[PDB]
Design an enzyme around this catalytic site. Structure first.
Site, mmCIF file in Angstrom:
data_model
loop_
_atom_site.group_PDB
_atom_site.id
_atom_site.type_symbol
_atom_site.label_atom_id
_atom_site.label_comp_id
_atom_site.label_asym_id
_atom_site.label_seq_id
_atom_site.Cartn_x
_atom_site.Cartn_y
_atom_site.Cartn_z
ATOM 1 N N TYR A 9 0.830 -1.198 0.000
ATOM 2 C CA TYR A 9 0.000 0.000 0.000
ATOM 3 C C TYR A 9 0.867 1.251 0.000
ATOM 4 O O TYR A 9 0.605 2.194 -0.747
ATOM 5 C CB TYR A 9 -0.916 0.014 1.232
ATOM 6 N N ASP A 10 1.901 1.248 0.839
ATOM 7 C CA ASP A 10 2.732 2.429 1.059
ATOM 8 C C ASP A 10 3.502 2.801 -0.209
ATOM 9 O O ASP A 10 3.711 3.978 -0.511
ATOM 10 C CB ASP A 10 3.722 2.166 2.198
ATOM 11 N N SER A 15 -34.286 10.568 18.458
ATOM 12 C CA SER A 15 -33.586 9.766 19.456
ATOM 13 C C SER A 15 -34.407 8.518 19.781
ATOM 14 O O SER A 15 -35.346 8.190 19.056
ATOM 15 C CB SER A 15 -33.321 10.588 20.723
ATOM 16 N N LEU A 16 -34.035 7.815 20.848
ATOM 17 C CA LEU A 16 -34.658 6.534 21.188
ATOM 18 C C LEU A 16 -35.292 6.550 22.571
ATOM 19 O O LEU A 16 -34.738 7.131 23.506
ATOM 20 C CB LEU A 16 -33.621 5.412 21.147
ATOM 21 N N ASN A 17 -36.445 5.894 22.692
ATOM 22 C CA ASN A 17 -37.057 5.630 23.989
ATOM 23 C C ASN A 17 -36.238 4.547 24.691
ATOM 24 O O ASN A 17 -35.629 3.700 24.032
ATOM 25 C CB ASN A 17 -38.505 5.157 23.807
ATOM 26 N N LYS A 39 -25.774 -0.998 20.739
ATOM 27 C CA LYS A 39 -25.885 0.456 20.781
ATOM 28 C C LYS A 39 -24.503 1.077 20.953
ATOM 29 O O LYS A 39 -23.948 1.088 22.048
ATOM 30 C CB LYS A 39 -26.797 0.887 21.932
ATOM 31 N N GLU A 71 -23.078 5.878 13.598
ATOM 32 C CA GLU A 71 -22.339 6.397 14.746
ATOM 33 C C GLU A 71 -20.876 6.546 14.371
ATOM 34 O O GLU A 71 -20.281 5.643 13.769
ATOM 35 C CB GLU A 71 -22.452 5.442 15.941
HETATM 36 N N1 LIG Z 1 -4.536 -2.455 2.525
HETATM 37 C C1 LIG Z 1 -3.653 -2.099 3.475
HETATM 38 O O1 LIG Z 1 -2.818 -2.909 3.865
HETATM 39 C C2 LIG Z 1 -3.699 -0.726 4.045
HETATM 40 C C3 LIG Z 1 -4.696 0.207 3.626
HETATM 41 C C4 LIG Z 1 -4.713 1.498 4.185
HETATM 42 C C5 LIG Z 1 -3.745 1.836 5.143
HETATM 43 N N2 LIG Z 1 -2.804 0.936 5.530
HETATM 44 C C6 LIG Z 1 -1.791 1.318 6.541
HETATM 45 O O2 LIG Z 1 -2.286 2.324 7.450
HETATM 46 C C7 LIG Z 1 -1.263 3.280 7.754
HETATM 47 C C8 LIG Z 1 -1.736 4.705 7.386
HETATM 48 O O3 LIG Z 1 -2.305 4.728 6.062
HETATM 49 P P1 LIG Z 1 -3.421 5.800 5.570
HETATM 50 O O4 LIG Z 1 -3.428 7.082 6.550
HETATM 51 O O5 LIG Z 1 -3.076 6.273 4.067
HETATM 52 O O6 LIG Z 1 -4.765 5.166 5.581
HETATM 53 C C9 LIG Z 1 0.001 2.903 6.944
HETATM 54 O O7 LIG Z 1 0.954 2.229 7.774
HETATM 55 C C10 LIG Z 1 -0.555 1.953 5.839
HETATM 56 O O8 LIG Z 1 0.395 0.945 5.474
HETATM 57 C C11 LIG Z 1 -2.753 -0.307 5.021
HETATM 58 N N1 LIG Z 2 -26.070 4.093 18.914
HETATM 59 C C1 LIG Z 2 -26.420 3.136 18.024
HETATM 60 O O1 LIG Z 2 -25.622 2.243 17.761
HETATM 61 C C2 LIG Z 2 -27.761 3.183 17.368
HETATM 62 C C3 LIG Z 2 -28.598 4.330 17.497
HETATM 63 N N2 LIG Z 2 -29.798 4.356 16.899
HETATM 64 C C4 LIG Z 2 -30.246 3.315 16.168
HETATM 65 O O2 LIG Z 2 -31.472 3.364 15.563
HETATM 66 C C5 LIG Z 2 -32.235 4.593 15.572
HETATM 67 C C6 LIG Z 2 -31.881 5.474 14.340
HETATM 68 C C7 LIG Z 2 -33.155 6.338 14.125
HETATM 69 C C8 LIG Z 2 -34.335 5.488 14.663
HETATM 70 C C9 LIG Z 2 -33.733 4.276 15.378
HETATM 71 N N3 LIG Z 2 -29.498 2.206 16.012
HETATM 72 C C10 LIG Z 2 -28.280 2.088 16.574
HETATM 73 N N4 LIG Z 2 -27.546 0.923 16.380
#
Ligand SMILES: NC(=O)c1ccc[n+]([C@@H]2O[C@H](COP(=O)(O)O)[C@@H](O)[C@H]2O)c1
Ligand SMILES: NC(=O)c1cnc(OC2CCCC2)nc1N
EC number: 6.5.1.2
Length: 313
Positions: free
Chosen positions: A38-39, A84-86, A116, A171
């Protein structure tokens, strides 16, 4: 020499290969190639972009390091509100929720159960496959436009697999190990530590200098779409599959439960697995799976009637 013509073609090639590697590594958490592979390619791209800066594109992996510094965030309206959620806190609360759902629907109902994730709610908008807006939930109808910062979040795709126009929600959080590391760094530099990774993630996304945010090791789990676009899912479980399919990172721990009995067992299962997870959760979210039945139940003013979050104390 390397001409502008040769470099224009080669650059796209590199972007495509590197973003595919970045997908496997950051989104699937399962890299296919050794880092040095990658690098090497990444370095080649950087050289081309340094020589021909006009070849820099928003979906180029070099841009993950950030650069822009905002004066403030613009308002980000959510015309489809982010509810939000109940809450429920007891086994009784959950069975009572199920009793209300059956009473309203008139038959047994399946639940898609998700962990969650304890972080910051975000909404990601795409036009024709291109990332064009990222936003916090804010107050549900107006959040903050944090598009530039979310460009630095590696699991967030800058260009989707298909040129689809959708807005998805999930999230953004900070993994435990990164929270630990960041607080140590703040201790070294004479700063107040963050009290928990949720707070760390929120303070991060409030940063105006995108270069700092790119260093903060944030990640995402997407779990819903506000605007479907061409998307086809008819159930929440299907939505989560589809979300993975078009290129988003989803949480692998969700389960489709065919009885409230299976729901509580899921809750007990992960209430203890909790400690083993690399990220913090504050509970479990129980969703009526069929979208048709979700619409039937509708929403209160605060929350959906078709969902409840079981909270751990
Ligand atoms: N497919 C892969 O192996 C892969 C992909 C993205 C980043 N990386 C690693 O993550 C680190 C930072 O890379 P990036 O900030 O460009 O995502 C580097 O050490 C890089 O080698 C590896
Ligand atoms: N914190 C979470 O991981 C999470 C939050 N919310 C919801 O669903 C909400 C989205 C809008 C109606 C239901 N799912 C989740 N996994």
């Amino acid at each position: 020499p390397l001409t502008l013509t040769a470099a224009t073609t080669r650059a796209q090639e590199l972007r495509k290969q590197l973003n595919q590697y970045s997908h496997e590594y950051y989104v699937k958490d399962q890299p296919s190639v050794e880092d040095y592979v990658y690098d090497r390619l990444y370095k080649e791209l950087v050289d081309i972009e340094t020589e021909f800066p006009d070849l820099i594109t928003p979906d180029s992996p070099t841009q993950r390091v950030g650069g822009k510094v905002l004066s403030g965030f613009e308002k980000a309206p959510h015309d489809i509100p982010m509810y939000s959620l109940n809450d429920g806190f007891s086994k009784e609360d959950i069975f009572a929720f199920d009793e209300r759902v059956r009473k309203a629907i008139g038959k047994p109902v399946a639940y898609c159960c998700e962990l969650k994730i304890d972080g910051l709610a975000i909404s990601l908008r795409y036009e024709n496959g291109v990332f064009v807006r990222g936003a916090t939930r804010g107050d549900g109808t107006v959040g903050e436009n944090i598009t530039e910062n979310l460009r630095t979040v590696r699991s967030v795709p800058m260009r989707l697999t298909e040129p689809i126009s959708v807005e998805v929600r999930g999230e953004c959080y900070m993994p435990k190990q990164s929270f630990v590391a960041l607080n140590e760094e703040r201790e070294e530099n004479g700063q107040d530590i963050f009290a928990n990774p949720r707070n760390a993630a929120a303070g991060s996304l409030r940063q105006l200098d995108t270069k700092i945010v790119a260093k903060r090791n944030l990640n995402t789990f997407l779990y819903t779409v506000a605007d479907f676009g061409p998307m086809k899912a008819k159930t929440q479980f299907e939505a989560l599959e589809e979300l993975s399919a078009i290129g988003f990172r989803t949480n692998p721990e969700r389960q489709l439960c065919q009885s409230i009995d299976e729901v509580w067992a899921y809750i007990e299962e992960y209430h203890e697995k909790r400690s083993t997870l690399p990220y913090e959760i504050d509970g479990i979210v129980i969703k009526v799976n069929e979208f048709a039945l979700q619409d039937e139940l509708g929403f209160t003013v605060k929350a959906p009637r078709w969902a409840i979050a079981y909270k751990f104390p």
